[PDB]
Design a protein around this ligand. Structure first.
Ligand SMILES: COCCn1ncc(NC(=O)c2nc(C3CC3)ccc2Nc2cncnc2)c1C(=O)N(C)C
Ligand SMILES: [Mg+2]
Ligand SMILES: [Zn+2]
Length: 315
């Protein structure tokens, strides 16, 4: 057989939650196949179809600062780390579908939120009234899966193919943060009342939804230098959307206003407290081996507080 192998440093460090996939775009397909062969198995997909699929997905991500090909692979790698440290908890189809969901979850993102598409009256807003971009990401996923030589699930039966596309559809839709607030609250109640049941499919769905949020936000779970640099990329998009809001004659929210740059550290603090910490807390409760995501999230929160107190500088 031909086994995928990484250089020594990547071989060791890819198992760490805070792994950064590096600046070499040409190595990311290899990194993704490696993670699929180790988390799913070398027999999960035909290498030729997986390779063709990967390259078509890459092609349908856009040259935007943040919601790009590097983000897709980064989210996939966080999912890899969760699956490998929880390997007894997931099904064959869940392993197969979830790395693919993560790779595909922002397909054809233009760097604009669901809100902007609503305010702009974009055609996608007429087609998909809620989770507008996330329904578009899924539709794009189906398009690519239906191209010639792209059916990576060809050896699944009809009913298995349908289950995995449904795992994928729900996972991608779950990356709509508007849906996360409700989903985490339900999971918090279920956990504290002891009703949470991983044998209940409607409960698996919520746990995977939370896993997808955690993978999607995983830039707040890298070492500080990565987190700080990645925050420049996310704000490049937010500020561009704010500009487009101003062009529509609508005052943008403060985080999207490039004139309010001095409030980024307080904005970050607000986001860690309201969204990120609660997310990784609940995930650690359900999947205790995901502790390192929560720990790195707390460390970065501490760093933003250091920035607010003028002990650290972010230029
Ligand atoms: C009401 O919203 C304003 C309150 N607010 N302030 C900031 C913020 N989000 C982020 O910073 C952010 N969002 C995402 C995705 C949800 C969009 C991912 C990463 C983020 N940070 C970050 C930090 N380091 C490195 N990479 C990325 C929000 C928010 O809640 N959103 C939903 C965007
Ligand atoms: Mg998205
Ligand atoms: Zn994303």
């Amino acid at each position: 057989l031909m086994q995928f192998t990484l250089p020594v440093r990547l071989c060791k460090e890819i198992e760490l939650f805070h792994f950064d996939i590096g600046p070499f775009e040409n190595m990311w397909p290899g990194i993704f196949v490696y993670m699929v062969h180790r988390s799913c198995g070398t027999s999960c997909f035909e290498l030729e179809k997986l390779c063709r699929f990967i390259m078509s997905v890459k092609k349908n991500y856009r040259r935007v600062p943040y919601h790009n090909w590097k983000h897709a692979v980064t989210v996939a790698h966080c999912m890899y780390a969760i699956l490998q440290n929880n390997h007894t908890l997931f099904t064959d189809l869940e392993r197969k579908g979830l790395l693919i969901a993560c790779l595909c979850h922002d397909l054809d993102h233009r760097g604009f939120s669901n809100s902007y598409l609503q305010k702009f009256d974009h055609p996608l807003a007429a087609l998909y009234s809620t989770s507008t971009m996330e329904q578009h990401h899924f539709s794009q996923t189906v398009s690519i899966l239906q191209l010639e030589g792209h059916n990576i699930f060809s050896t699944l039966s009809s009913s298995e193919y349908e289950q995995v596309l449904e795992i994928i559809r729900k996972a991608i839709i779950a990356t709509d943060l508007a849906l996360y607030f409700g989903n985490r609250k339900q999971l918090e109640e279920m956990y504290q009342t002891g009703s949470l049941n991983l044998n209940n499919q409607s409960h698996r769905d919520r746990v995977i939804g939370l896993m997808m949020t955690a993978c999607d936000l995983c830039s707040v779970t890298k070492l500080w230098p990565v987190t700080k640099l990645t925050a420049n990329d996310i704000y490049a998009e937010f500020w561009a959307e704010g500009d487009e809001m101003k062009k529509l004659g609508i005052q943008p929210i403060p985080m999207m206003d490039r004139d309010k740059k001095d409030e980024v550290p307080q904005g970050q603090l607000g986001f860690y407290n309201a969204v990120a910490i609660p997310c990784y807390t609940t995930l650690t409760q359900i999947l205790p081996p995901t502790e390192p995501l929560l720990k790195a999230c707390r460390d970065n929160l501490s760093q933003w507080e250091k920035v607010i107190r003028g002990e650290e500088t972010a230029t």
